[PDB]
Amino acid sequence: LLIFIYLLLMAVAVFLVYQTIMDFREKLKHPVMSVSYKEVDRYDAPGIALYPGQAQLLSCKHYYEVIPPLRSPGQPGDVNCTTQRVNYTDPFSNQTLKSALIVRGPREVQKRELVFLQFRLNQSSEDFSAIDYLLFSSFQEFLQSPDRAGFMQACESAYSSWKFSGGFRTWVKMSLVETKEEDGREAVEFRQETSVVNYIDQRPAAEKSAQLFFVVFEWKDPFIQKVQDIITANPWNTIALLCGAFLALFKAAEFAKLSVKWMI
Amino acid sequence: LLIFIYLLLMAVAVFLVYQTIMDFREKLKHPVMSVSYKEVDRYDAPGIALYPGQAQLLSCKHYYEVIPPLRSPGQPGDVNCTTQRVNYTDPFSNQTLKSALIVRGPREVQKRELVFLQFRLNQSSEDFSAIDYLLFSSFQEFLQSPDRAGFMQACESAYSSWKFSGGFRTWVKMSLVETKEEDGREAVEFRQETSVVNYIDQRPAAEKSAQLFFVVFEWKDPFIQKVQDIITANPWNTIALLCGAFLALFKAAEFAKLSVK
Amino acid sequence: LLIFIYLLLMAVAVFLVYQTIMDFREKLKHPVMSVSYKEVDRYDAPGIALYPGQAQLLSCKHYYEVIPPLRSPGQPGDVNCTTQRVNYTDPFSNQTLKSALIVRGPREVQKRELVFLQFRLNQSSEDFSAIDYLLFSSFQEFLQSPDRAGFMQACESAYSSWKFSGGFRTWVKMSLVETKEEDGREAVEFRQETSVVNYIDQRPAAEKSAQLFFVVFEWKDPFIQKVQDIITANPWNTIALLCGAFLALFKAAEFAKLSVK
């Protein structure tokens, strides 16, 4: 006789709407990630902020794929780079004054341009000597700034610093990572990898008290990495899917009405 | 005259169903990944398992952003940390007995807390001296455990061990990575970045034969990195998507029927 | 009276057409990434290209989880590995000739197999001595090749090289990363982590002028890490989604006609 079957029809309808709402809520909480790479023809000269306390910069120069042997390992030489001294106050603690030396970074990644730095510390009471360094994207931005101390204070918190020790040569391969945030901020940051090589001290024994620091800065590759967060929750697609499901259920109900019209 | 056109209609129907099934099967095999970061106000004191064979722990202390200079680089000092000695058997080979010293790690990342350790090895025949260490999440979990040896054996396989060498000071910045998989094991693991600094030996030449090991443990940042695997294949969304496609083909047939008539 | 409301109906139709098309265009530009791991029962013996200028290979051997202590740190020993010398021209600059020594890498990861290498450099004028090395996937592929020089020239650009310094022992843990791209290059590359340990020089003072290089090669784990790029924009799904949306406005309008009737 006459049997009611559409109860299951709107039960399935409500069930589908419930799962659609749950799925949309779940997708709203777990954005996926996307990674891309961008090739550059030349880099913008970065800024390297060095923090030598009493160590004096013996030499600095711009080189290419090979560094010529040092004429004199531990004596003053020629400085052939653009440097800028700055004084500011540590944001972490406002009782310590920080003096930094800013050096232009290399640009020609295609020609494997590099910057070679050599410092000397005469004497100290510490038993683990190292020099702090920080990397920021644009040296020109540092130059044309009404408040250089404020720029340095902001970069102290916005960036992370590393160390290089004496008695070694440290080779640093540096790369750029850009990130797109939900609010739309373009966050640029530095990645870096180090390689340490023992320094063979051939200086006379009278000069062995002084400690030498050697460091090299140059780009790893011309590829800048890009990371973006993609949200896979589109309300209009969900609305269209729900509408299509509702139409399908309505036409299935009409077909069932016809079927029970013939026989049932 | 009368021309049959709906042949293409259900041909397109079968076409769409076939590609929908293929897309669903393909999506079932390639789950996407999602990455999030969680900021903490304080960490849970980790456990550092150290394996010094004959080296003796000269000193250990809890510090902050700067370490004061050593009063004496290579003489016994004061131990100011909580340590626990344990013995167990190596899961990799059940013929070797391992003795470990467990140290409770730093807790406050907001104040940049450090743990500083200094060991001394008197003499040995090896020409490459290093000390093994392992990191696990909770020291309290180790403390309150009916079988500490079983805990160590499980952590030996569940975690990865590293080394720090003599004649250096090693600075280790550690971070926490949580991972969620299909069945829900909520795995937690450690990541590190290490920096080595030469030790300027100013000790008298009579004591130069002994090797000094210095190591520092610190949290890199208060951010824990969470990774999850998201499956983008929803069977019920596909069913509703397939259901809607059939309606258009049926609805267009009536419009096509009117055009024929 | 008679009020026209379907103006909003095809306004919503045009809005829904502009949407999902903006979405398709956006999704075609941002493919998602998928990460998987594959367990192996045994690796394939890699090729290690070493570039010692004047340093002579004192010793090479295949070991397991522990290396026995050296019988003599700085004297010639026994070479117990398969090596092949090759000469070619640097692709970066065609005016320099490069001579490489190819060593067949470790094979079994379940037993923690090691390759141990020891070189000696007698004397040189440089003040920073290091040896270059490069890793490629298959040593057998290198062996059976009509042009070995061309193989090395291709591997120079297709791979990246690292260095290991003298006065240290360098331990290298290496792993394989596979990547699937659009047209199917299935690029395989090497990831590596290093650990340096000070070498305790106990040689007589007369032989201290020579530099000793020690290096160890081992697989980190039996997990090959795979990366794929998934495009989430399916035109067939988009067409079906648009088809369902159009029918909703048509049937709702018919219901609206009944409502005003």
Ligand SMILES: *[C@@H]1O[C@H](CO)[C@@H](O)[C@H](O)[C@H]1NC(C)=O
């Ligand atoms: C930074 O302070 C030092 C104090 O020793 C001073 O000599 C130097 O001129 C200052 N430089 C700048 C840029 O303020």
Ligand SMILES: *[C@@H]1O[C@H](CO)[C@@H](O)[C@H](O)[C@H]1NC(C)=O
């Ligand atoms: C644990 O091992 C150590 C060193 O091997 C030794 O004191 C003894 O065998 C064990 N000690 C205790 C307290 O279990």
Ligand SMILES: *[C@@H]1O[C@H](CO)[C@@H](O)[C@H](O)[C@H]1NC(C)=O
């Ligand atoms: C390859 O180079 C080596 C060293 O430069 C030298 O024996 C010769 O030039 C070449 N040998 C062979 C066998 O091709």
